[PDB]
Design a protein around this nucleic acid. Structure first.
Lengths: 45, 99, 146, 217
RNA sequence: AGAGUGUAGCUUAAAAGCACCCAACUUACACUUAGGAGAUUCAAUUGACGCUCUGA
């Protein structure tokens, strides 16, 4: 039941690209985040 | 004082000449229409499923409550009310990859 | 007419309760009606903070449609301004050079009036069962200022 | 009017990983991403590529590629957590790391004298105490470990009636935070069971009415 | 084993009226627009395939 709020869309009229970037927390888990600049790994200390 | 954030920045009006055109075809439009119809049907099915599950849970809770009332005319006064425990309740979302 | 049997037929303000009060600055919240055999909590405050904005907006829309279809009154749903955070990045062979990154963080707030024990527990279990990936729930109190 | 005092304790475990994705949802995500691309305009990467290549061509007729190459290299070097956890065991059914996609309910097997079925861990309450207190006490004694069973409310779930002297069963659920189960090699038949396995294990009607209020997902 | 029953979630409706979801506007709710899936369980007022209750 976690896919009802997955297929989303930016309802704003003027916006830039939001590439599905991944981020790992302080344990070891990725998450698809819609953010600019097509990065691949975000090492957040 | 709430600060508004949905206001678009000033860098959203000087540049607007990159991808103004959109080219498609009739096949793409009919495929998108079929996909949207299938997704609407799937969402309706999921909504009906959630509705019947909620109805089943509600009727089960009502049956349990009425049985507890007819079997104990004292435990209902302490079972209906809620003790102060879920005030700082929190539930973090699921994960993709295990640690 | 007052004496005719058709008296009081054009009355309409008795069927409404909206007296057009100043609801923009009024801080009068309903207390938790406690009695024992009939529990009713006041107004809560659901928080959906995450790193993505469209996911939070979609979850807020979903929960608002749900609480609208479940026949429960809704107070007001607003949004707080985002807080920018920098992500420092230290160089590999050099433990003295630090970089910086940019990421977003949004949060939504929804409130529901009537929450009886069974109804509120069913609502919260449905919310936690259909909790999407990314966002997180952290219900607080109605005395959260901005 | 004698009434035998019993109860029940059903465990609720939140899922860790999400359910698998269907092809129609994949096509929907693809078309939504295409619509997002067609609606988006003036991005940082788009400019940093286009105007940079234009400047390169201009100063050659008289960055971005290496950056995305380093990004791809860092993505290929970093290996994410292997989601394959429900297929590499296929034997340790009583483990916490068994199923992480759905909800799991715990039950303990106990063989009595007149009854020989697989009943959910009951909870005997006393008139001198409350009901939720006795329920959580029985849950703590039958678990012999350090767990945080956060109850979702004081209201019950489902009740039954069996006689031979009357009796009654009170179902109670509680959300589990972390899993610090001490000594997983106990002789108690406590197995983490989900939904289909739960419907397949039970047999009588007293347990068939439990799968109607649990989160079926 | 007995009883109550019988048009999708509803009908002192006989294949309709209420309901649901998706796409556009909205911080959000909501109106509106543009669309979709829905039923008389069987053989001629009768008997039996589905649900509930009373039991063991």
């Amino acid at each position: 039941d976690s896919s009802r709020a997955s297929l989303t869309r930016v309802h704003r009229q003027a916006y830039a690209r939001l590439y599905p970037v991944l981020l790992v927390k302080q344990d070891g888990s990725t998450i698809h985040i819609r953010y600019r600049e097509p990065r691949r790994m975000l090492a957040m200390p | 004082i709430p600060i508004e954030d949905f206001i678009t920045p000033l860098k959203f009006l000087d540049k607007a000449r990159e991808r103004p055109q959109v080219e498609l075809t009739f096949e793409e439009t009919e495929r998108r229409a079929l996909l949207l119809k299938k997704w609407s049907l799937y969402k309706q099915q999921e909504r009906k499923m959630e509705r019947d599950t909620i109805r089943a849970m509600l009727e089960a809770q009502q049956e349990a409550l009425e049985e507890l009332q007819l079997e104990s005319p004292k435990l209902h006064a302490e079972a209906i009310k809620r003790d102060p425990n879920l005030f700082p309740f929190e539930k973090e979302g699921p994960h993709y990859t295990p640690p | 007419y007052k004496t005719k049997p058709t008296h009081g037929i054009g009355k309409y303000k008795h069927l409404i309760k909206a007296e057009e009060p100043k609801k923009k600055k009024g801080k009068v919240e309903v207390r938790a009606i406690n009695l024992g055999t009939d529990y009713e909590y006041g107004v809560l405050n659901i928080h959906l903070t995450a790193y993505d904005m469209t996911l939070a907006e979609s979850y807020a829309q979903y929960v608002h449609n749900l609480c609208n279809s479940l026949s429960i009154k809704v107070e007001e749903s607003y949004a707080m301004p985002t807080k920018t955070i920098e992500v420092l990045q230290l160089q590999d062979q050099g433990s003295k050079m630090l970089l910086d990154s940019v990421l977003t963080t949004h949060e939504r707030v929804v409130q529901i009036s009537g929450l009886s024990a069974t109804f509120a527990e069913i609502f919260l279990e449905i919310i936690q069962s259909s909790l999407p990936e990314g966002v997180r729930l952290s219900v607080k109190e109605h005395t959260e200022e901005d | 009017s004698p009434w035998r005092l019993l109860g029940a304790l059903c465990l609720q475990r939140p899922p860790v990983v999400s359910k698998p994705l269907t092809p129609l949802q994949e096509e929907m995500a693809s078309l939504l991403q295409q619509i997002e691309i067609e609606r988006s305009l003036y991005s940082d990467h788009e400019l940093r590529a286009l105007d940079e290549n234009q400047r390169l061509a201009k100063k050659k007729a008289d960055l971005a590629q290496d950056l995305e190459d380093m990004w791809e290299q860092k993505f290929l070097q970093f290996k994410l957590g292997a989601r394959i956890t429900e297929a590499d065991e296929k034997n340790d059914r009583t483990s916490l790391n068994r199923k992480l996609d759905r909800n799991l309910v715990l039950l303990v097997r106990e063989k009595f004298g007149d009854q020989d079925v697989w009943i959910l861990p009951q909870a005997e309450w006393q008139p001198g105490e409350t009901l939720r207190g006795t329920a959580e006490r029985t849950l703590a004694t039958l678990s012999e470990n350090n767990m945080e069973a956060k109850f979702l409310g004081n209201a019950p779930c489902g009740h039954y009636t069996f006689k031979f002297l009357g009796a009654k069963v009170f179902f109670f659920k509680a959300l589990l935070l972390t899993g610090d189960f001490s000594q997983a090699g106990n002789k108690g038949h406590h197995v983490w069971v989900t939904k289909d396995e739960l419907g397949d294990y039970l047999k009588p009607k007293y347990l068939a009415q439990v799968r109607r209020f649990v989160s079926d997902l």
